[PDB]
Amino acid sequence: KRINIRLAHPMAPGNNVTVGYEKFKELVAEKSNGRVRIQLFGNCMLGSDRVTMEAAQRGTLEMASSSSPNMANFSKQWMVFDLPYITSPEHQQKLYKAIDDGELGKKLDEIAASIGLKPIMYSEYGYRNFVTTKKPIKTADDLKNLKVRTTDSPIEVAVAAALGMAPTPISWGETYTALQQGTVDGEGNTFSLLNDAKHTEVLKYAIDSAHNYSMHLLMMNKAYYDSLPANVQQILTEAGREALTYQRSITSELEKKAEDAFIEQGITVTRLSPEERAKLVERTRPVWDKFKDDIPAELIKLVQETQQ
């Protein structure tokens, strides 16, 4: 027959994650000669991360993508990637290698299996930077007192509290309204998502904190995956791998465009000195011990090994 597979996600038009899933869609169609069709429900068409991944887990959707921080709703183990400053941009290829070809990726795959999901793409999303609507922020101490939107990650909540901020978990689709209404003073995200989602209209200041690393985890309902013929299973996984290579390749080009757009629209972007970054690293480091019982030590070590 034909097979139609629905894929929902929260990310904005033109965003690195979004474009990756457009490439996935194209590759699935090519490899199947049109027999398998991915229907894309991006940009919170069917809701934000949690609600659509819950639908994928239940089987009311075939596929969904959630940011890794929002995946904490489904397993605590994903929080390894939220630990503040567990990774930094300088080591990204070695992180990719461990996920793609190594033991780390196998462990992630097992986490997904344990919650009824088949991973198809570990999409790059990027490093979050703190941004504000009104308050000048240039240093760690300037973050104090800010009311800040978070994802659902317990670690993001704890990071904010350790920085002296007041964390406020808001779904992605509702975050712009909260900023516009003054419910929150700021947020932390990639400059690209912020620009693509047109948060840049309400923002005034940014710092290159890189205080959270996120992926966008594209998951298929495991029962649905296991129901498919083997040739279609292989199409999906091969398309995922090829789409991931493509999506990583365009990510930093798009990030550069967004940083330029921030500039153009008058947002002040402060580059932290080594000293000021080290303060942030240490101020957030106590969060790690608060989650030692929820994140396997072996998994922390596999991630840290990528940064050596």
Numbering used by the authors: 29 to 336
Would you copy out the relevant sentences from the publication that reported this structure?
O. alaskensis employs a tripartite ATP-independent periplasmic (TRAP) transporter (OaIsePQM) to import isethionate, which relies on the substrate-binding protein (OaIseP) to scavenge isethionate and deliver it to the membrane transporter component (OaIseQM) for import into the cell. Like the ATP-binding cassette importers, TRAP transporters utilise a high-affinity substrate-binding protein (P-subunit) that binds the organic acid and delivers it to the membrane-spanning transporter subunits (Q and M) for uptake. The structure of TRAP substrate-binding proteins comprises two globular lobe-like domains connected by a variable hinge region, which is formed by two β-strands and a unique extended α-helix. Substrates bind within the cleft between the two domains, which close around the bound substrate via a hinge-bending conformational change often described as a ‘Venus flytrap’ mechanism.
To define the molecular details of substrate-binding, we determined the isethionate-bound structure of OaIseP. OaIseP purified in 5 mM isethionate produced crystals that diffracted to 1.25 Å. The asymmetric unit for isethionate-bound OaIseP contained two monomers that are bridged by water molecules, where domains I and II of each monomer interact with domains II and I of the opposing monomer. We used Proteins, Interfaces, Structures and Assemblies (PISA) to assess the nature of the interface between chains A and B, calculating the size of the buried area to be 624 Å2, with a Complexation Significance Score of 0, which suggested that the formation of this assembly was not likely. Isethionate is bound in the cleft between domain I and domain II, with a closer examination of the isethionate-binding site revealing several key contacts made by OaIseP. The sulfonate moiety of isethionate forms salt bridges with Arg156 and Arg177, as well as forming hydrogen bonds with Ser95, Asn98, Tyr153, and Asn217. At the opposing end of isethionate, hydrogen bonds are formed with Asn77 and His244 via the terminal hydroxyl group. No water molecules directly contact isethionate, and the binding site is lined with Pro38, Met39 and Leu221, with Trp200 occupying the bottom of the site, providing a large hydrophobic surface for the hydrocarbon backbone of isethionate. Aligning the open ligand-free and closed isethionate-bound structures gives an r.m.s.d. of 2.7 Å over all 308 pairs of α-carbons. The conformational change primarily involves bending of the hinge region within the spanning α-helix and nearby β-strands that connect the two domains.
